[PDB]
Design a protein around this nucleic acid. Sequence first.
DNA 1: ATGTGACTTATAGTCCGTGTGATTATAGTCAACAT
DNA 2: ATGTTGACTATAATCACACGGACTATAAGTCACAT
Lengths: 77, 76, 76, 77
Amino acid sequence: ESFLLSKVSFVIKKIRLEKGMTQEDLAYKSNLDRTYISGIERNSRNLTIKSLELIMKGLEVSDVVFFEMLIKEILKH
Amino acid sequence: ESFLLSKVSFVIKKIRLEKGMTQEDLAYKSNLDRTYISGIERNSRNLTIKSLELIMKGLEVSDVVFFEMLIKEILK
Amino acid sequence: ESFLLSKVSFVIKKIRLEKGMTQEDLAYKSNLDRTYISGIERNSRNLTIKSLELIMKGLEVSDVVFFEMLIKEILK
Amino acid sequence: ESFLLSKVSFVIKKIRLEKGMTQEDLAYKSNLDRTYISGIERNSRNLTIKSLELIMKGLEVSDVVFFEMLIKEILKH
DNA sequence: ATGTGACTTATAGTCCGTGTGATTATAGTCAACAT
DNA sequence: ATGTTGACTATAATCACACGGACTATAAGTCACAT
């Protein structure tokens, strides 16, 4: 599938667990379905920037902070 | 509209220019539609990550450079 | 404790008595433990439907007759 | 498995739909797990009088009218 | 060249439900001794 | 006869998650016509 997606997928989960959230909490605060949060983490779904933005707000994290961890995950071995 | 969306778009336009590309050529290079691109640059589109990825390929810019730039752009 | 659970227990005891049964006999007839039965009637047990069902069979009473009674008891 | 159980589980669903509720509303209002409401209807499951009571409160229905519909369902052919 | 508009078609995102391993609270069942 | 106190062990009930189908909103991709 897509390189960037699974990275975006990975980072959303990583943060979520770092903050001791559950998918239920997250989909809560992101005002998306818990099915969608699952869908994203599970099968790296192809979300929209707007949806990503909602998730960032849900993770109680900033644009910047997210993208900084995104860059880190991309760079890894 | 969205704050992020506008700066993604701004960034896309910034890079296209710093490189000296036309929209026509960014569309060709990324195998997407020119009106599609025009839309994004006037910020009338809400890309998916996949699309963004194709535009990065077209701009010939790695994900990292794009995001390094987007961050800087984000901080006024 | 619970209102319903109390009325259920009361009903179980009521029917046992109008039939002149002992607890010992109610437990023999439904193959459950006598201390188990005791416990319900002193309202110290929160039984499951399955258990309730075994007790009805031990009381020789249909589900319907039981609930008809349970409703009436519920209404003071 | 159990005669009465599938009757109880049938009636919980009947009411739930009659009141235009979804499972996960009822799971909230009944102050029980999401998956328990499913599990009760889905298969049958052997609930407790206390849990049944919670569900009745959740269906926004009285002990009495629940049991009245229970009786009616038992009596069917 | 770029910017519209408007018009399909793919798919992102929603909504309601099923099914499941793992853990925790508690009912199910049965001792010993009471009265 | 019934009551009560511990117990052990089955299972009710919880919690975090995956997975599917069907439906709705909207992004993806392509026309025509501006400039």
